[PDB]
Structures are given as structure tokens and as C-alpha cells.
Design a binder for this molecule. Structure first.
Ligand code: HEM
Ligand SMILES: O=C1N[C@@H](Cc2c[nH]c3cccc(F)c23)C(=O)N2CCC[C@@H]12
Length: 392
């Protein structure tokens, strides 16, 4: 009877999560709002760990055509394959991905990322009055991350196009079915025309390393660009927006980090636990009849895990709704878990850290409006406020 998602577009999670957690079963049935498909939803940490480490619950099978799904529309450019990451790992690109996303890449980029983040805060601190941390800080920083580390050199107009596509394609509601599908077609056709060129521009960005990988056609490249937009653009920008909100609402913790810069890493990891991002769930499909903490899951059925509900599980985390850097509980779910642990985790932790440090070097940064007055994009997969009015 319960339809999904829960329309908790702001940082205030839906009460339903705590409700499902407190229920009897470790999985609860819900119904997709966008398609009427029946779906299983996991909200408890213990269950989620079991589910995400059991590779018999498949991620790639969860998007074969005909799959039950939480999204109103198939999240691909029509005609195209999908699961670009499986396509890329299957083409023997793991080590390439390691170079473009791993500690080697972090090393290449951590210098400029931190420089950029400090310049943006500097420029903002040398103004009189208030300013918009979303537009004036997050947007250029996440834009530069996507450009410099993932796709290659983007113009302002190309950046705007892909950001619109992500905001239009990656929604539960607010756009027609055909608008949403059209966003993926737009992205696809942009990368069909440009992936080659973006690959060849200067720097050491992932898309170029993929193109120079021995084994990739324009089609394959285009599918890689789309995947990298979807996985790294609206995620990074959403997350940093929410992290800045979390930080500005916790001056005490900010002051602690100002006095103790060695506590910032623990702080980033608490941010990934505390700050919500996605409004939907990671999802997998039972590749056979399976049993989840006693619940029988039939082949073909799809099991969702809300990382938000799991990150806020009190059985796992003491005082789960409090911001506590240096807390010592289990591992957070902000990046998932298991074989599909976000490969973007190093670059995302890089940029997250650069941001937490720029803020902590400048105590007194605060909201210029009440948290309740912040305006949210409604219907997005990845939460993002319209603006973050802030000031010193
Ligand atoms: C440069 C930025 C990023 C890149 C390039 C990136 C890339 C990816 C890719 C390719 C996947 C698919 C892994 C797979 O299914 O095998 C993934 C998964 C994931 N990413 Fe990221 N990511 C980025 C940033 C982020 C951020 C900021 C978050 C914060 C929550 C995040 C959270 C996740 C999660 C939870 C998954 C797992 C989804 C699932 O298990 O179905 N990523 N990422
Ligand atoms: O809302 C969604 N979330 C992702 C998985 C996810 C959860 N939390 C995340 C944080 C960062 C990156 C992610 F991919 C996720 C997903 O499978 N979706 C399918 C339909 C709706 C969309």
C-alpha cells in the first residue's frame, strides 16, 4: 500500500524510514509511484549489509529491459545499452579506471582542487554582504571536478547543457516522461558528437584515459561520458551543497575542526553518513529465488536499499540523527557497499575534504536565512537546494 519514494526533497528525511526500520520484517514491500511496479525496500543496516554483499542480488540485471524500477522512466538514452560501468570493466578498463579515479588521480588533482576551493572562499570573503554558496562555490567547484578529472575541457554552455540534462533526467517527478527521456537523448547525442574531442583536450581526465585504452568506438565513448555525468555531476554538487548546509548548522563542530585540522577526515566521513543525498534507493535484482533475513525474494524481484535510512539506523549508530565527527560506529553507506562501492569515492572525498577545510579555516561562515527558509529542488534523485544564502 506504501508508494515510493517518500517525497522528502529537503534534508528532513521521511518519517517512513524510521517506520519501516521499526517494523517486523527486514524487507518491506512498496509500490513505485512512477510505474506501479512492486518493489522491496530495505531500511536496516544489518539487512542492507547482507543484501549488498550477496552478489546473487545483481545490479546490472536490475536494469535489463522489463525490470521493476522506482524511476518513472528508463535511465538511458533510448537505443543504447546502459550499465556503462559494466561495459567498461568488461572491456578490460579496470586498471584504467584505477588511474583515472584512484590514488594516482587524487595525487594529480588534489593540488588544484584545494587551490580552487580556497580561491572561491577567498573571493567570497572579500565581498561585503551575503552570497550564494551553491552558485558561487559548489557549482564552479563541482563543474571544475567534472571537467578537469572526468570529461575534459568544457565550455560554460556545454557545462550548462549537461547540468540541465542531469537535473531533467534524474528525477522522480516534475518533468513529463518524454522531457525526462529527452534529457538522456540530448546527453547521448552531445557525447556522440563531442566525446572524441573532449577526450583529446589537455590534462589527465578519465575520458581521455578511456579513449587511449587498448582493448573504443564513439558510441562506447558517448556512453562513458553520459555515465560520468550522471554518476559524478549531480552527486558531487548535491552532496557538497548539503555538506555545506550541515557545516553551517554546526558551528561548534566547525570551531573544533578550525582548532584541530587533523580531525577533518573523520569529519568528512561523518558528513557522508549524516548528510542525505539520494531520495531513492540503490537497487538490485534477485538472480534466483533467495532468502533475506527469512524473507523469500523471488527471481526477478527487485530489492532497494535506502542508504539514507541505513546511515540513520540507531541499531548501527548511537544517536544516529546527531552530527558527531570522530564518532566510532560501523562504516557508513554514503558510498554504498560491496562490489559496487562508488569508484568515485576518492575524488569525491578529495573535493569534500577541500571544502571542509576551506570552511574550517574561516569560522563565522553562517546562513543568511533560516534553515527552514532554504528552497529545495523538488523531485530530484539527488537533493540540491536552489540556493544557499550565506555570509560572514
Ligand atoms: C567524481 C565523482 C563520482 C564519480 C566519477 C562516481 C562514479 C560512480 C560510478 C561509476 C558508480 C557505479 C559503480 C557500480 O555500479 O559498479 C558509482 C556508484 C555509487 N556512487 Fe559514485 N561517483 C562519484 C561521486 C559520488 C558521490 C559524491 C557520492 C555520494 C553519495 C557517490 C555515491 C555513490 C553510491 C552510493 C554508489 C552505489 C550505487 C549502487 O550501489 O547501486 N558517488 N559512482
Ligand atoms: O535516486 C537514485 N539513487 C541511485 C543509487 C544511489 C543511492 N544513493 C546514491 C548516492 C550517490 C549515487 C547513487 F547512484 C546513489 C539509483 O540507483 N537511482 C535509480 C533510480 C533512482 C536513483
Amino acid at each position: 500500500t506504501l508508494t515510493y519514494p517518500f517525497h522528502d526533497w529537503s534534508q528532513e528525511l521521511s518519517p517512513r524510514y524510521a517506520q519501516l526500520r521499526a517494523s517486523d520484517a527486514p524487507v518491506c514491500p512498496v509500490v513505485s509511484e512512477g510505474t506501479g511496479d512492486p518493489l522491496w525496500l530495505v531500511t536496516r543496516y544489518a539487512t542492507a549489509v547482507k543484501l549488498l554483499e550477496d552478489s546473487r542480488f545483481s545490479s546490472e540485471a536490475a536494469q535489463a529491459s522489463g525490470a521493476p524500477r522506482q524511476s518513472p522512466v528508463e535511465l538511458r538514452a533510448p537505443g543504447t545499452r546502459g550499465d556503462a560501468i559494466a561495459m567498461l570493466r568488461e572491456a578490460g578498463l579496470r586498471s584504467v579506471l584505477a588511474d583515472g579515479l584512484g590514488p594516482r588521480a587524487v595525487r594529480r588533482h588534489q593540488g588544484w582542487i584545494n587551490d580552487l576551493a580556497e580561491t572561491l572562499m577567498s573571493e567570497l570573503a572579500s565581498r561585503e554582504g551575503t552570497f550564494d554558496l551553491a552558485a558561487d562555490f559548489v557549482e564552479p567547484l563541482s563543474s571544475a571536478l567534472v571537467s578537469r578529472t572526468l570529461l575534459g575541457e568544457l565550455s560554460a554552455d556545454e557545462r550548462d547543457l549537461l547540468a540541465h540534462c542531469a537535473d531533467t533526467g534524474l528525477r522522480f517527478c516534475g518533468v513529463t516522461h518524454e522531457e525526462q527521456v529527452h534529457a538522456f537523448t540530448q546527453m547521448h547525442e552531445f557525447f556522440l558528437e563531442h566525446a572524441r574531442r573532449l577526450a583529446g583536450t589537455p590534462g589527465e581526465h578519465l575520458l581521455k584515459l578511456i579513449a587511449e585504452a587498448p582493448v573504443l568506438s564513439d558510441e562506447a565513448l558517448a556512453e562513458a561520458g553520459s555515465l560520468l555525468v550522471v554518476a559524478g555531476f549531480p552527486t558531487s554538487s548535491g552532496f557538497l551543497c548539503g555538506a555545506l548546509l550541515t557545516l553551517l548548522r554546526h558551528p561548534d563542530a566547525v570551531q573544533e575542526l578550525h582548532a584541530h585540522p587533523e580531525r577533518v577526515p573523520s569529519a568528512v566521513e561523518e558528513l557522508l553518513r549524516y548528510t542525505p543525498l539520494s531520495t531513492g534507493s540503490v537497487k538490485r535484482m534477485a538472480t534466483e529465488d533467495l532468502e533475506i533475513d527469512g524473507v523469500r525474494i523471488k527471481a526477478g524481484e527487485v530489492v532497494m536499499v535506502s542508504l539514507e535510512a541505513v546511515n540513520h539506523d540507531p541499531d548501527a549508530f548511537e544517536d544516529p540523527d546527531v552530527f558527531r565527527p570522530g564518532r566510532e560506529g560501523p562504516m557508513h553507506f554514503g558510498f554504498g557497499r560491496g562490489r559496487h562501492f562508488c569508484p568515485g569515492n576518492r575524488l569525491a572525498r578529495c573535493v569534500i575534504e577541500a571544502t571542509v577545510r576551506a570552511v574550517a579555516r574561516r569560522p563565522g561562515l553562517r546562513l543568511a536565512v533560516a534553515p527552514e527558509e532554504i528552497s529545495w529542488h523538488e523531485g530530484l534523485f539527488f537533493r540540491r537546494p536552489r540556493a544557499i544564502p550565506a555570509t560572514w
